[PDB]
Design a protein around this ligand. Structure first.
Ligand SMILES: [Mg+2]
Lengths: 41, 313, 132, 52
RNA sequence: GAGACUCUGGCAUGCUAACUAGUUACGCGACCCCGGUCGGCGUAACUUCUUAGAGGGACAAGUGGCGUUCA
């Protein structure tokens, strides 16, 4: 019987499956157009 | 009314030159790393027979040599490696006196005080460690830190202004006050990651290069950006000459020394014999450092080769 | 033989396709990128990912790939299509026309046209492809 | 000794004369003695199939 | 399923460290011609060696042809 993965680690490993690559979608990144300042501190 | 020229070359590497470190006290002495684990300690004869001869070899790094730096005094040099740590090499006997262990991640920057007394070391873990010469981490910031990464930090040669600039892979040229020890200014506007930052001999303007392949000038008379001259190809290293009002810049295959009086490129000096002109990479320039007077420039390249570029006139 | 698995390859295409800019050609640097941005449990997995991610970045830096829709390519297509020459090729000062289209237009309403030329008949009957 | 406590040109000249004579001096012999394995009378053989 | 994984080998003069591990500095003693030798004796720190936990470490990294210059 193949047991399910669980971060709890009671029944199995903390580790994700070594094959299973849960790949997340990249965040919306803004390229800064002008050099500018907000000088403080 | 002057032009650079290849005075000589230091042929002594198997892998390519990750970083080369210079010192103003001894002009005929350069300490150069490679992809292999060594750091070759050259002796620059500059004679008819050979330009340089390997004097010592600072063997110690477990794996590939990332960064190496020499102090302004020149008898010692601290190097950093993928072990995480750095090693204070005694450059005469060519061996470590004191090893700086402490950094959690790759040490991408290290900086002496103007006194060459205090040491500060920056790594990709959101920390800035600060030490004395006796070698104790007096304080580091871990919880109170950046959301992103701090790839490099450097010092201002001017002693009266205790200021350090820091580039990174977040594309932000940060500026910190050593007195306040909190950032003076961030500078959003830069697309692409920054490689190197350097300050001018006068201490008025300072160049900055990065992924853009652009020499973005910040002002030291007033902490303000002024204007940018395009290095073009990835700027792997930059360095100001002390005697001249020059900006040396590693721009891809060749070196570029711009003038600030008239904002215009003068010339790019590429060797004609380029071998990889057939579905091959050309030799991209990775590092540079001016000599004490600024008449010789040591430049380390991706073709496992350190060319020196003397000013003729 | 050092060949990439589908878990290796798909990961490299996802890495270059999502963060082409962060990535580069050299393994050991863009490795630092891959370990930071992506949490790879094994060092072997990390390093393999990085080495195929590097060589692939050089492939794209060399040129455009066939079976993938890059957003940059979408922008250049919008740019190229908006490329317009000075004049259209269709605008012509004189248009050649055959005698059948002359006869057919003359029977139709559109008899006289200013810029037409009922050209000569194609003499020399050799149009069929040889047999055998 | 010459690379460490004196100048390195001696290390390269010695090392190069060595490279120009013979590469085994530098390329290590990784070779080591292989163990006999269960399932046979010898080292590689798996057990003797015996007709008859 | 292969691969992946786990363990082992290896790069770590780096982190953490040890009179049930030793160490480097010397000196003595018998003899041989000042020293050399000795599991004969003494001077402390440390972990280079030793032992083993945590981390870290190399990846087709370089090039040529060939190939959608892709794999
Ligand atoms: Mg398998």
């Amino acid at each position: 019987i193949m047991l399910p993965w669980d971060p709890s680690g009671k029944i199995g490993p903390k580790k994700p499956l070594p094959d299973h690559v849960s790949i997340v979608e990249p965040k919306d990144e803004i390229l800064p157009t002008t050099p500018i300042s907000e000088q403080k501190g | 009314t002057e032009q650079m020229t290849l005075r000589g070359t230091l042929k002594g590497h198997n892998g390519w030159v990750t970083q080369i470190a210079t010192t103003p006290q001894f002009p005929d002495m350069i300490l150069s790393a490679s992809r292999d684990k060594t750091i070759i300690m050259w002796k620059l004869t500059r004679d008819e027979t050979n330009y340089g001869i390997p004097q010592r070899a600072l063997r110690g790094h477990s794996h590939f040599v990332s960064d190496v730096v020499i102090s302004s005094d020149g008898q010692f040099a601290l190097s950093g490696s993928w072990d995480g740590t750095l090693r204070l090499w005694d450059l005469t006997t060519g061996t470590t006196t004191r090893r700086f262990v402490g950094h959690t991640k790759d040490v991408l920057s290290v900086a002496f005080s103007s006194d060459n007394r205090q040491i500060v070391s920056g790594s990709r873990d959101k920390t800035i460690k600060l030490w004395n010469t006796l070698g104790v981490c007096k304080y580091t910031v871990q919880d109170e830190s950046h959301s992103e990464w701090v790839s490099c930090v450097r010092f201002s040669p001017n002693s009266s202004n205790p200021i350090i600039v820091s580039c990174g892979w977040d594309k932000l040229v940060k500026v910190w006050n050593l007195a306040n020890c909190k950032l003076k200014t961030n500078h959003i506007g830069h697309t692409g990651y920054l490689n190197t930052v350097t300050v001018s001999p006068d201490g008025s303007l300072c160049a900055s290069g990065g992924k853009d392949g652009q020499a973005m000038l910040w002002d030291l008379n007033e902490g303000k950006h002024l204007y940018t001259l395009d290095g073009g190809d990835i700027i792997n290293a930059l360095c100001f000459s002390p005697n001249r009002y020059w900006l040396c810049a590693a721009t891809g295959p060749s070196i570029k020394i711009w003038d600030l009086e008239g904002k215009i490129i003068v010339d790019e000096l590429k060797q004609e014999v380029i071998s990889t002109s057939s579905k091959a990479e050309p030799p991209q320039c990775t590092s540079l450092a001016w000599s004490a007077d600024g008449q010789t420039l040591f430049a380390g390249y991706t073709d496992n080769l350190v060319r020196v570029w003397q000013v003729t006139i | 033989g050092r060949v990439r698995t589908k878990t290796v390859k798909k990961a490299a295409r996802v890495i270059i396709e999502k963060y082409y800019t962060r990535l580069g050609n050299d393994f050991h640097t863009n490795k630092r990128v891959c370990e930071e941005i992506a949490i790879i449990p094994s060092k072997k997995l990390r390093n393999k990912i990085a080495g195929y991610v590097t060589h692939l970045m050089k492939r794209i830096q060399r040129g455009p790939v066939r079976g993938i829709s890059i957003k940059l390519q979408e922008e250049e297509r919008e740019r190229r299509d908006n490329y317009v020459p000075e004049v259209s090729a269709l605008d012509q000062e004189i248009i050649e026309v055959d005698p059948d289209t002359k006869e057919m237009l003359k029977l139709l309403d559109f008899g006289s046209l200013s810029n037409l030329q009922v050209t000569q008949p194609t003499v020399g009957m050799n149009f069929k492809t040889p047999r055998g | 000794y010459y690379q460490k406590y004196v100048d390195e040109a001696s290390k390269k000249e010695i090392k190069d004369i060595l490279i120009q004579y013979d590469r085994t001096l530098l390329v290590a012999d990784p070779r080591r003695c292989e163990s006999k394995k269960f399932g046979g009378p010898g080292a590689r053989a798996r057990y003797q199939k015996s007709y008859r």
